[PDB]
Amino acid sequence: DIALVQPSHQPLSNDQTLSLSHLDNDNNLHVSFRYLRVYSSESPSAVVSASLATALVHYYPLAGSLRRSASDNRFELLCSAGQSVPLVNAFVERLVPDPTREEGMVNPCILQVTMFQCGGWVLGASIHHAICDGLGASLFFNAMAELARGATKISIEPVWDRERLLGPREKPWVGAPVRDFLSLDKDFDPYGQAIGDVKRDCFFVTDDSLDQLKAQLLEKSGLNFTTFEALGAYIWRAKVRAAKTEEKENVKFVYSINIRRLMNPPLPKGYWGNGCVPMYAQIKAGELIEQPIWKTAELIKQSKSNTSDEYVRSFIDFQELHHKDGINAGTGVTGFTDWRYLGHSTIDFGWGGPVTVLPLSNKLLGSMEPCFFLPYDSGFKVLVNLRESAMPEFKEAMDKFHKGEFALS
């Protein structure tokens, strides 16, 4: 059973093509991001279709179709009256739609509500990553949630204005910290690498294992690292090691940061497009599998150095210059995404906050083996997508961690 939800009240009089920002049109984001929310305890089917319909008054672009435009290969978003977001009513893979490129450009936002008699239900979503980032999506979902809870109007009104706020410079200019991560190769597909079948697996990590880990890196290097730095170091090393990567292959650690607060001037509060740029560390595989973790952890710590206004403006301008030319960060890229402490909590439709949340996409940040830190004696889940050949050695690495045999050099 699949309901085609249109806006409650119709906002568009005549058609409307919006362009997307230079961050939106990054080739790494030509993918459908797939995730699901679980909840316990009018039915959730009905409650989310009503939220959806009223939020679509303000978020009507999600209803729209992406296409390529003949002048360049950039996406623009066609919006027209009659457009609708599909709501599917209803192993884990069947819980959120898996649209192919065409279906994903045709329906860049697709929701699914699976109820089963065991109280709970699941909300699945398949949003094309060019439309928006995780903060953007979460503006959209908190807006639906708040409307479900009886809100009078949406509390933050969404801002488009994308080609204006995140456009290129009239005289484009790209700095060394962008040029040194990236390369041009029209013939390279970050997501088409022959690495065998990619598995998904989950590992619990205890707040106490991490504190052990930081205390020892501190004793041996006099720096305190963040969980992200220390644990990311450890997972990166373990991954590259298990993939038996050739010693002189350049490997990379990539993560996404929110730049909204950091621009001059800051981005609007209502801004729901892509408002993240990828940050990197790179090193030879051999150096990584054999240097101490404190060095690798330090290398990641130093990468947020490049978090600045100019770094973002460089990245955009690089895309102006080379969109048609195959921009990529090459092979050996591992993506990492921190999810531990977003506000999952407030996407409350009536049934409380989601008891667990789960990303299914394994193509992200120009990686095929992206890793995610998922929300909460105490500890959190680490999800790793890793090629099948590497996964047994990797399980053993996480089991050594679990037992605090960290192998620090």
Ligand X SMILES: COc1cc2ccc(=O)oc2cc1O
Q: Applying CB under 8 A, which residues contact a copy of itself?
A: 1-4, 65, 67-68, 73, 99-103, 105-107, 142, 146, 149-151, 155-156, 207, 226-227, 261, 340-341, 343, 345-346, 348, 352-353, 376, 378
Q: How far is the CB of 33 from ligand X (least distance, A)?
A: 4
Binding partner of 183, given a copy of itself, ligand X, Ca ion, none, CB within 5-8 angstroms per partner class = Ca ion
Binding partner of 127, given a copy of itself, Ca ion, ligand X, none, CB within 5-8 angstroms per partner class = ligand X
Q: How far is the CB of 408 from a copy of itself (least distance, A)?
A: 21
Binding partner of 129, given ligand X, Ca ion, a copy of itself, none, CB within 5-8 angstroms per partner class = ligand X
Cα–Cα distance, 126 to 136 (Å, whole number):
14
Q: For 269, what's the count of Cα atoms within 13 Å in the CB-facing half-sphere?
A: 3
- Report the residue from 3, 18, 52, 127 that binds ligand X according to the rule CB under 6 A: 127
Asked whether position 133 contacts ligand X by CB under 6 A, the answer is yes
Asked whether position 132 contacts ligand X by CB under 6 A, the answer is yes
Binding partner of 137, given a copy of itself, Ca ion, ligand X, none, CB within 5-8 angstroms per partner class = ligand X
- Report the residue from 33, 160, 236, 253 that binds ligand X according to the rule CB under 6 A: 33
3-state SS track over the chain: CEEEECCCCCCCCCCEEEECCCCCCCHHHCCEEEEEEEECCCCHHHHHHHHHHHHCCCCHHHHCEEECCCCCCCCEEEECCCCCEEEEECCHHHHCCCCCHHHHHHCCCCEEEEECCCCCEEEEEEEECCCCCHHHHHHHHHHHHHHHCCCCCCCCCCECCHHHHCCCCCCCCCCHHHHCCCEECCCCCCCCCCCCCEEEEEEEEEHHHHHHHHHHHHHHHCCCCCHHHHHHHHHHHHHHHHCCCCCCCEEEEEEEEECCCCCCCCCCCCECCCCEEEEEEEEEHHHHHHCCHHHHHHHHHHHHHHCCHHHHHHHHHHHHHHHHHCEECCCCEEEEEECCCCCHHHCCCCCCCCCEEEECCCCECCECCCEEEECCCCEEEEEEEEECCCHHHHHHHHHHHHCCCCCCC
- Residue placing its CB nearer to ligand X in the complex, 33 or 401: 33
Beta bridge partners of residue 66, listed in sequence order: 77
Asked whether position 134 contacts ligand X by CB under 6 A, the answer is yes
How many of the chain's residues bind ligand X (CB under 6 A)? 9
- Report the residue from 137, 174, 235, 360 that binds ligand X according to the rule CB under 6 A: 137
Instruction: Tell me which stretch binds ligand X (CB under 6 A): 70-78, 125-133, 196-204, 374-382.
Output: 125-133
Cα–Cα distance, 138 to 145 (Å, whole number):
10
- Residue placing its CB nearer to a copy of itself in the complex, 122 or 347: 347
Binding partner of 132, given ligand X, a copy of itself, Ca ion, none, CB within 5-8 angstroms per partner class = ligand X
Binding partner of 34, given Ca ion, a copy of itself, ligand X, none, CB within 5-8 angstroms per partner class = none
For the segment 170-189, give every residue that binds Ca ion (CB under 5 A): 179, 183
Any binding-site annotation on 409?
yes
Give CA angle at 110 (112, 10), nearest 5°. 110
- Residue placing its CB nearer to a copy of itself in the complex, 173 or 341: 341
Q: How far is the CB of 300 from a copy of itself (least distance, A)?
A: 13
Q: How far is the CB of 337 from ligand X (least distance, A)?
A: 5
Any binding-site annotation on 255?
no
Asked whether position 337 contacts ligand X by CB under 6 A, the answer is yes
Q: How far is the CB of 350 from a copy of itself (least distance, A)?
A: 9
- Residue placing its CB nearer to a copy of itself in the complex, 343 or 404: 343
Query: By the 8 A CB rule, do 370 and 360 touch?
Result: no
Cα–Cα distance, 195 to 388 (Å, whole number):
8
* Numbered residues of the known binding site: 134, 179, 182, 214, 226-227, 290, 304, 340-341, 409
* Numbered residues of the known binding site for Ca(2+): 179, 182, 290, 409
Would you tell me which residues interact with ligand X (CB under 6 A)?
Answer: 33, 127, 129, 132-134, 136-137, 337
